[PDB]
Amino acid sequence: HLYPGEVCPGMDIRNNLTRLHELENCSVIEGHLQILLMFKTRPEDFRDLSFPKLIMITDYLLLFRVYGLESLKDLFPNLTVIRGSRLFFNYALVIFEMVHLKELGLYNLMNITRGSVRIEKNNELCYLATIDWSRILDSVEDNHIVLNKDDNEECGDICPCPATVINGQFVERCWTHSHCQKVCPTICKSHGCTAEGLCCHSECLGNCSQPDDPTKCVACRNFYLDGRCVETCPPPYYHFQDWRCVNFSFCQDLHHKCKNSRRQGCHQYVIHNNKCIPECPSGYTMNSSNLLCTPCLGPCPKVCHLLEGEKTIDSVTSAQELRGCTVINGSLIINIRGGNNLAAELEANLGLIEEISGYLKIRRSYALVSLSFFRKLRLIRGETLEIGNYSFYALDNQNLRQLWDWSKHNLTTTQGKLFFHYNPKLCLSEIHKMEEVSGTKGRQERNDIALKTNGDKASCENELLKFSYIRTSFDKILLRWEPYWPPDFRDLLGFMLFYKEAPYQNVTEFDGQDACGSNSWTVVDIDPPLRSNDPKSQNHPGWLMRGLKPWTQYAIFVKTLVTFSDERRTYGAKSDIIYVQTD
Amino acid sequence: PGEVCPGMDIRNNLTRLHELENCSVIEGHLQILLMFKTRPEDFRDLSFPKLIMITDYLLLFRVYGLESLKDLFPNLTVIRGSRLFFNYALVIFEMVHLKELGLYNLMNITRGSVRIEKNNELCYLATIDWSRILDSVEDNHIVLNKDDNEECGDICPNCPATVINGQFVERCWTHSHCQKVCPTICKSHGCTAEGLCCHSECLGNCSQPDDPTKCVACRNFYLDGRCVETCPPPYYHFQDWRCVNFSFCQDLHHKCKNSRRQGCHQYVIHNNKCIPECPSGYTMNSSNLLCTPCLGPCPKVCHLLEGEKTIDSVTSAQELRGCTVINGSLIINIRGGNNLAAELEANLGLIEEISGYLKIRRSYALVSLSFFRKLRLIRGETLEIGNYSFYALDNQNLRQLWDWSKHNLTTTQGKLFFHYNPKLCLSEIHKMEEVSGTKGRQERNDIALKTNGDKASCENELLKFSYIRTSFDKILLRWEPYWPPDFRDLLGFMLFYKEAPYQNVTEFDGQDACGSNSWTVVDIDPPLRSNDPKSQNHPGWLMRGLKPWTQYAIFVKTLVTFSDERRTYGAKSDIIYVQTDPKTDSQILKELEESSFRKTFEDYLHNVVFVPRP
Amino acid sequence: GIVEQCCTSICSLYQLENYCN
Amino acid sequence: NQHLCGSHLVEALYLVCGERGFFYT
DNA sequence: CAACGCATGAGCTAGATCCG
């Protein structure tokens, strides 16, 4: 058979072992499975507990503070895929602060579809440097495995198993003391695999019973229908939870239970586009009896009624709940702490937000690169405001670079006043074009949006300067660039010239960082061009280099240095980096 | 004769020689150099036949077409040589079309040596007896001329001769003037036309013998058409060739106490000679311009350029070397360089007083203003607009203004400005108005409350050392465990130590650079906590690299993170003296982010697994 | 929220007795 | 110390609840 | 009218279209 057991909802197990007995013949756990907070448990009675027919777990698996589990291969011998529809702080498997875990033992795990794994804080865990995670789950950088017993190479680590060469060394990869993992030839990647290397049917994962049979597979991929695997199951049936197909009688009677709302966790499942979807999306309403979705008269949005007036987006567990809703009736904070990169998943679930009726706040977020994942922002209505009468707000965003691409985006904030502070890679030019296209024009503070602490660690200029004449000798090399004048003839402290060695052409760009270091390009100051009162004059300025080694390549660029002012002009000018070699 | 006139410096034109229409004794130096587009037909009608005694030197450096000097300076008699050029008093270097030297009338160059070079058409150089013209003969330098290969027939007229090195050659300047010699009975006063010697005071030619009123170059001193060996009172010596009264030396001191650009040389009266500056250990009294000696440290005195001087680096600070009292404003803008440990204390470590207003604008490399070590007062006669006298912006690393225990500042007027100085704390700019006293003459100054204190702490508690044990080479240091009220926040400890000669070391001193330190920073991981008053929870660190019979300084500094309200904590122990028998800034932030990432997850995990009862 | 009423302020033993049935 | 957060929170809450068990909806 | 003569090259005298 394929899935011989009974479908089985999510469970929490606490303070005892008596509640564990209701997992006797469950084969798939939609929902999550937690094992928490078991203190009075000797290690001797986990030897006679085993769950053989557990095959796939859809959401995640959390184990936290149990006593007496030496290795997991007594309980979960056969879970092959954990799928990850509902994550847990962007992790799909989290094992946190066990005391007696010796071996990981999950020796049959093949494919983690969506999410990452975080194995943290175990005072006895060994065998973590022998897993080869990069084949099991399909991302590799988002994991976090620190502070363990394998912080040192001291657990022994004997294993009698391809000994793969994914890294640069010939190390062997094994699960436990007496089980070595399966990596077979890589012609078919995730389509299943037998012992003697013969590839399976295309629609399978993990093990196979007999090769090329969609009837006797074990861990099926796209959907499930009557003991088979069908790529797109036909419309006598509809999709459900993206793993099943089920008939008309099932998706209707769940209305009749929780139309009498005894608990607000149930959802009235309504048919739409061959799916059994809980809430029919924006621009659609349900009819009275027949339970379909029809086109709306005018616009009818799905108003996304936010509890308590605030929300704190931390990860894809909290940004999962705003999927598909369009008019937020509250205010959003954004506080993403640490992080490697989260802009790949934040777009596809909260990127359909049209009207927002509160304030934003982007505080302490480290790994943000751009605010572009908000896609269809039209108006920040702003009936409320923050403390100090603000609507937009930023703090301490150490890698923010861009608010929005202003060539094809429009944003009208009706009332409220801006606020900007400590954005070390955001220029004033991107927030001043923000100032003209927003609904506010001259409502500022003095002290307004901070003119000093923005953009200190990234240089950025707009008008370009070209070069005109370059002459080269065996010790001296001469520059001459075409002039430039701001609208104020006194608003010029001069120029500054940079030159560094570079033996190859892959030199970086100027970061703008001042840390008293050797990558400050050995700055040579240039006297300002004296006021010529003449178009053609001796104010086509140049300089002469003197201390050169012969037959080497130098990288030169030139930048002006003007006084910044209260008026919103004179951003400066900066040339591009070129290369010149002395003979 | 004529009147005295200061020294020229002419280049590339000829129109500047009209200013010698009436000069007779040009005190200063005349140097004519770099004239390219001048044909020889431009030098025929030009003559200064009354220039008689020049004092400093002469220099002729690449003029073109100067055919002979016998029509420009035909009556030079004495050059003095007080100030010299490479220790040379007459420099003829690299002319062309120069046939004859022809300065047929100079008699006694006093001090120096003549340097004649590389002028490829010059003869009449072999018939010039420099034994009786300059008194110190052995340093002249006459090489690479026309007369390496003798081709030109230098026959001259009837004219007397002497011997120099065994050869009895005749002596002549040009082909129509010969070198005037005086017989050895009247050595330096110079002879007349028939051979009598002149008065006992004159140099070179004299018009009538035995009359000191009418010779043409006084050797010692000139005084009012007569000639005198030592000028008596009420006169004074000036530039050691002429004598003036008191009124002729006073008024030009006030007439260029204000500079056009430089300077003047402000004249003093000191022992019968007007000198530019008194020597060391002597200072001018401003009343009658007399020069009086010293007691203790003497003022210099250092005035400055146009009221404000900016220091960008060490090379900008070199003009203020040794300057004690400064009559104007000052501004410091230091960014970086190399070897910034002790050099900023070296250039301005003896500064005494400053009288304008002080600006610490845009300074980044500094940590503390303790390098004004001897400064006592900013009185501030002139005021900064906004009624300010003390201004500070863009100080990203400044941590400590001044030590108000070992030092006593005062000031009188003006106001203060401390904005956008994060590391500069708030209680230390509350600690200065007891010493400066702006709570006296009480005024509303403008310092914002939120603009400081960021990345800083001032509510620190006091760590007490617990046990100390010294061997011959090792010391252990265990102390009492400090915890912030949320014990996840403490990243670790920081220990500092350095050798110490006495019991007077202050806490933040002498390092004052970007990535350098005088101390020896060492780290130690925190211990564990077991909710137990008595346990194995006292932290520790072992110090190994010691020396016998030395005396050190040690203290403990915590390092914690920030909760999201700008509310920090921390501690700092006392400075304890004990006696025996690369972490860059980018690595600080990313290692503090990872500790705040592990705090956030296990703060979230408690939040959903415990659910209260309704 | 246990981490906001027993970490940002002190909490009494009447309050955290609610967490256990 | 009566400021119960961090890793001590999961241990100090156990001794005051040693037999009743934790509570969930 | 577009390198080189009417100098040298960072050794108190200028600073590389610095001068025709």
Side-chain angles (χ1 to χ4, degrees), chain B residues 156-422:
Chain B
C156 40
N158 302 114
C159 278
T162 184
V163 74
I164 188 184
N165 227 326
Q167 309 322 310
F168 193 72
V169 80
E170 314 314 279
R171 291 325 204 278
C172 54
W173 276 107
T174 66
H175 87 281
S176 296
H177 324 295
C178 58
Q179 198 186 340
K180 297 181 185 294
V181 291
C182 178
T184 181
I185 62 172
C186 294
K187 276 81 67 178
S188 68
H189 322 115
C191 282
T192 77
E194 75 281 328
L196 295 201
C197 39
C198 290
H199 212 73
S200 88
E201 323 166 28
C202 299
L203 259 187
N205 196 358
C206 72
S207 64
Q208 277 193 231
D210 287 331
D211 255 4
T213 315
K214 57 184 71 174
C215 61
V216 293
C218 281
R219 172 187 99 181
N220 200 358
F221 281 110
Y222 182 79
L223 176 142
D224 308 333
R226 262 197 65 241
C227 199
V228 156
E229 305 315 291
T230 54
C231 292
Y235 281 115
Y236 289 129
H237 310 86
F238 177 73
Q239 210 98 40
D240 61 275
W241 81 273
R242 55 152 165 170
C243 291
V244 294
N245 52 61
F246 167 74
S247 66
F248 282 22
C249 190
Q250 178 183 1
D251 60 333
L252 77 162
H253 168 82
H254 291 89
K255 192 263 301 173
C256 36
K257 64 98 179 178
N258 36 61
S259 88
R260 47 214 66 77
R261 52 164 311 280
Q262 205 292 321
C264 225
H265 289 88
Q266 56 272 19
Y267 286 120
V268 197
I269 305 297
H270 167 268
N271 193 8
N272 297 346
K273 53 175 70 66
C274 295
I275 64 182
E277 82 275 9
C278 289
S280 64
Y282 282 89
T283 312
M284 180 181 72
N285 183 11
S286 315
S287 66
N288 262 317
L289 309 98
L290 269 299
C291 189
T292 292
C294 268
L295 260 181
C298 316
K300 197 266 211 172
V301 168
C302 270
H303 282 44
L304 77 110
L305 310 189
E306 70 253 27
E308 277 267 13
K309 180 160 201 312
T310 306
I311 294 101
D312 303 359
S313 312
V314 177
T315 183
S316 45
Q318 280 252 31
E319 200 272 300
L320 268 185
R321 194 59 40 79
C323 289
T324 160
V325 52
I326 302 193
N327 195 231
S329 280
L330 184 49
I331 177 159
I332 298 192
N333 315 71
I334 53 172
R335 306 307 301 234
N338 63 317
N339 213 307
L340 322 182
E343 49 177 0
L344 310 99
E345 290 86 5
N347 70 277
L348 200 67
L350 77 170
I351 182 66
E352 182 153 29
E353 193 271 331
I354 179 62
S355 162
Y357 42 83
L358 188 60
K359 290 255 177 305
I360 309 306
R361 284 286 296 108
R362 290 172 310 272
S363 298
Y364 162 68
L366 85 167
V367 179
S368 160
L369 288 176
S370 88
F371 71 104
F372 280 75
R373 193 93 281 182
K374 213 95 70 193
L375 176 61
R376 63 185 180 180
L377 178 56
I378 300 94
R379 44 176 91 184
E381 270 67 37
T382 173
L383 214 61
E384 156 70 43
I385 197 55
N387 289 71
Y388 296 145
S389 312
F390 203 52
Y391 214 90
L393 315 172
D394 201 297
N395 299 115
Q396 207 143 21
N397 272 277
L398 161 66
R399 216 224 58 85
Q400 164 54 261
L401 190 65
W402 269 328
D403 200 334
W404 321 101
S405 279
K406 288 323 163 304
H407 162 59
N408 190 2
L409 160 71
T410 178
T411 181
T412 42
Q413 53 257 5
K415 297 199 141 295
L416 306 99
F417 206 88
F418 303 128
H419 281 250
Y420 294 94
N421 324 300

Side-chain angles (χ1 to χ4, degrees), chain A residues 14 91 337 363-364 447 516, chain B residues 420 514 564 596-597 609:
Chain A
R14 302 161 161 252
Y91 304 119
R337 296 294 297 273
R363 61 183 294 165
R364 296 304 299 270
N447 202 10
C516 201
Chain B
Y420 294 94
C514 325
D564 287 330
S596 198
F597 179 49
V609 301

Side-chain angles (χ1 to χ4, degrees), chain A residues 155-409:
Chain A
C155 286
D157 297 333
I158 185 76
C159 180
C161 38
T164 78
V165 284
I166 174 174
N167 263 297
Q169 324 80 39
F170 202 80
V171 200
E172 170 75 274
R173 296 290 187 267
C174 295
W175 274 117
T176 40
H177 170 91
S178 44
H179 293 254
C180 81
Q181 66 177 356
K182 178 175 70 176
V183 171
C184 46
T186 172
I187 171 175
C188 47
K189 184 221 281 193
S190 69
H191 293 284
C193 178
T194 61
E196 64 271 16
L198 320 181
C199 190
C200 297
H201 181 237
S202 51
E203 210 186 323
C204 284
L205 276 72
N207 286 319
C208 296
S209 71
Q210 263 66 34
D212 190 85
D213 198 340
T215 306
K216 47 174 64 71
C217 195
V218 292
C220 177
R221 181 192 217 177
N222 271 35
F223 298 100
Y224 162 88
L225 173 81
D226 193 37
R228 277 83 73 189
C229 298
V230 174
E231 275 271 4
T232 52
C233 67
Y237 294 112
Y238 316 126
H239 306 135
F240 183 36
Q241 296 296 109
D242 54 274
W243 73 280
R244 268 277 283 178
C245 310
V246 66
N247 52 44
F248 196 87
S249 51
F250 188 70
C251 190
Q252 53 169 2
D253 73 316
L254 305 175
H255 279 268
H256 297 325
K257 277 65 141 173
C258 62
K259 62 178 184 54
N260 298 114
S261 296
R262 80 286 186 273
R263 187 243 306 158
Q264 272 68 12
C266 194
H267 308 309
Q268 49 280 0
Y269 292 163
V270 60
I271 310 156
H272 173 73
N273 210 14
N274 292 319
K275 315 181 44 56
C276 190
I277 171 174
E279 289 85 4
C280 188
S282 88
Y284 281 88
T285 75
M286 181 207 197
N287 48 32
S288 159
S289 178
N290 210 24
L291 75 164
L292 277 74
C293 295
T294 42
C296 202
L297 58 90
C300 49
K302 187 142 83 59
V303 59
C304 176
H305 208 313
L306 187 132
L307 279 84
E308 79 252 18
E310 291 180 354
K311 178 152 271 303
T312 302
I313 310 300
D314 277 10
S315 297
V316 304
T317 309
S318 285
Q320 186 70 41
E321 291 154 315
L322 311 178
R323 165 188 272 172
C325 64
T326 301
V327 181
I328 319 291
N329 224 20
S331 178
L332 278 75
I333 315 296
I334 292 171
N335 177 19
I336 290 176
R337 296 294 297 273
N340 55 5
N341 177 256
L342 272 298
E345 186 81 330
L346 270 187
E347 201 177 330
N349 56 2
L350 61 85
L352 272 297
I353 284 183
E354 195 73 39
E355 282 89 7
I356 171 164
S357 278
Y359 53 96
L360 277 75
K361 187 185 289 185
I362 317 164
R363 61 183 294 165
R364 296 304 299 270
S365 88
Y366 197 88
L368 271 185
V369 190
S370 66
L371 214 57
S372 162
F373 46 77
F374 279 124
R375 188 53 85 193
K376 292 184 182 293
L377 263 291
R378 185 62 176 120
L379 69 89
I380 303 181
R381 188 187 298 251
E383 58 88 20
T384 184
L385 46 80
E386 208 211 12
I387 181 55
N389 314 311
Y390 308 112
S391 294
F392 214 92
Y393 199 102
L395 287 174
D396 200 38
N397 299 115
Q398 307 280 337
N399 262 329
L400 184 42
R401 226 172 200 189
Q402 181 179 2
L403 277 75
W404 286 275
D405 197 351
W406 290 114
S407 157
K408 51 192 160 73
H409 201 64

Side-chain angles (χ1 to χ4, degrees), chain B residues 480-517:
Chain B
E480 280 196 319
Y482 184 57
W483 299 113
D486 207 318
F487 74 101
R488 264 162 305 170
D489 279 338
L490 170 140
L491 258 55
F493 280 56
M494 283 193 111
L495 192 85
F496 284 115
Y497 65 98
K498 180 207 248 173
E499 287 73 40
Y502 292 100
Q503 278 204 120
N504 52 36
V505 181
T506 81
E507 65 273 15
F508 298 133
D509 48 353
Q511 44 93 30
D512 316 331
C514 325
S516 159
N517 192 359

Side-chain angles (χ1 to χ4, degrees), chain A residues 14 36-37 64 88-89 91 94 96 118 144 147 337-338 363-364 366 422 447 452 457 514-516, chain B residues 335-336 340 364 396 420 454 514 562 564 593-594 596-598 600-602 604-606 608-610:
Chain A
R14 302 161 161 252
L36 303 184
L37 282 158
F64 157 76
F88 184 90
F89 210 90
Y91 304 119
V94 51
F96 194 102
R118 175 175 178 156
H144 206 263
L147 212 174
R337 296 294 297 273
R363 61 183 294 165
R364 296 304 299 270
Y366 197 88
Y422 320 98
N447 202 10
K452 325 192 182 44
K457 275 83 180 188
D514 203 298
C516 201
Chain B
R335 306 307 301 234
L340 322 182
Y364 162 68
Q396 207 143 21
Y420 294 94
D454 316 309
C514 325
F562 299 142
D564 287 330
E593 200 57 29
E594 203 272 334
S596 198
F597 179 49
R598 290 182 293 172
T600 305
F601 182 68
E602 75 190 297
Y604 184 91
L605 188 71
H606 298 322
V608 300
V609 301
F610 308 111

